Amino acid sequence: GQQLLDALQHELVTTQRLLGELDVGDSEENVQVLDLLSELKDVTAKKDLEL
Amino acid sequence: PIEAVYHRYMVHLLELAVTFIERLETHLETIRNIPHLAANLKKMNQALAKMDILVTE
Amino acid sequence: LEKETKFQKERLSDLKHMRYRIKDDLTTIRHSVVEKQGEWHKKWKEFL
């Protein structure tokens, strides 16, 4: 169990250095833009039918 | 001696790993064909104008 | 992005408004058409 613990510690130190080289982005404005693009897809469908 | 407060973290990270393993191929094709919000960002601004002007006619 | 969204929602509002007023114009035109054809049909039924 302790050997598994330390192996996971070393692997996650490697993961943390790879993350610290590659830490870019956010999470909530992505959700907002996904929601608005879905809404405008709906609007596109309704405006095609309306046309 | 593991505890129960940390179980939510490990469940969530395990599920994120599963969602990684499920659809690597979609992420790979997404990154290769076109740059993230770069060339894509540009073309939607120039091509929204065509729906705008179509409404104008 | 939120600016474009507000313009398309105002846009579809204007589209539904113009749809409704051209529908009202259709109703008025059809009413006049019905009255004129009733008058013509009665007159030429008496004529022939």
Side-chain angles (χ1 to χ4, degrees):
Chain A
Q2 186 81 8
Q3 288 177 13
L4 165 63
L5 275 157
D6 305 338
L8 294 175
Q9 301 308 325
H10 163 265
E11 282 315 302
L12 294 174
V13 175
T14 309
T15 315
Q16 198 163 34
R17 75 162 279 273
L18 296 178
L19 269 167
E21 292 147 353
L22 282 72
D23 271 356
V24 176
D26 68 325
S27 291
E28 69 275 16
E29 302 151 12
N30 303 149
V31 169
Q32 301 146 19
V33 299
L34 279 161
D35 291 331
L36 64 87
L37 294 174
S38 62
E39 290 309 311
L40 276 296
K41 295 331 173 293
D42 291 331
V43 175
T44 310
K46 264 79 77 176
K47 66 92 176 179
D48 292 326
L49 298 163
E50 180 144 11
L51 200 68
Chain B
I2 52 170
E3 300 278 4
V5 192
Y6 317 97
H7 269 89
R8 194 262 295 166
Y9 284 161
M10 61 79 71
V11 164
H12 275 78
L13 276 296
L14 190 58
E15 293 179 353
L16 299 190
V18 175
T19 57
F20 291 166
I21 300 172
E22 273 172 339
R23 281 296 96 219
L24 294 174
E25 316 157 354
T26 58
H27 294 172
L28 272 294
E29 57 89 17
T30 303
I31 180 177
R32 296 281 68 81
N33 49 17
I34 29 194
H36 331 286
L37 56 139
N40 302 354
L41 192 145
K42 180 255 166 185
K43 61 181 68 79
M44 282 75 75
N45 295 115
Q46 62 91 30
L48 173 59
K50 85 202 156 58
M51 283 74 74
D52 300 340
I53 65 163
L54 188 153
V55 177
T56 69
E57 291 84 4
Chain C
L1 311 182
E2 54 88 17
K3 295 184 289 293
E4 90 211 2
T5 59
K6 81 179 189 294
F7 321 133
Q8 285 107 28
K9 65 178 72 66
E10 294 163 299
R11 174 174 285 173
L12 60 87
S13 314
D14 305 334
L15 294 174
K16 88 187 183 294
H17 298 136
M18 61 79 71
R19 156 165 323 270
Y20 291 165
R21 54 209 163 213
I22 68 174
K23 202 166 190 174
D24 166 53
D25 304 331
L26 183 63
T27 61
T28 313
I29 283 174
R30 280 216 171 171
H31 181 272
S32 159
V33 162
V34 165
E35 292 306 312
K36 286 185 174 174
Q37 280 143 355
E39 293 147 357
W40 198 100
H41 200 279
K42 185 183 178 181
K43 174 208 165 169
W44 274 73
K45 171 188 174 183
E46 290 144 349
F47 180 60
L48 294 172

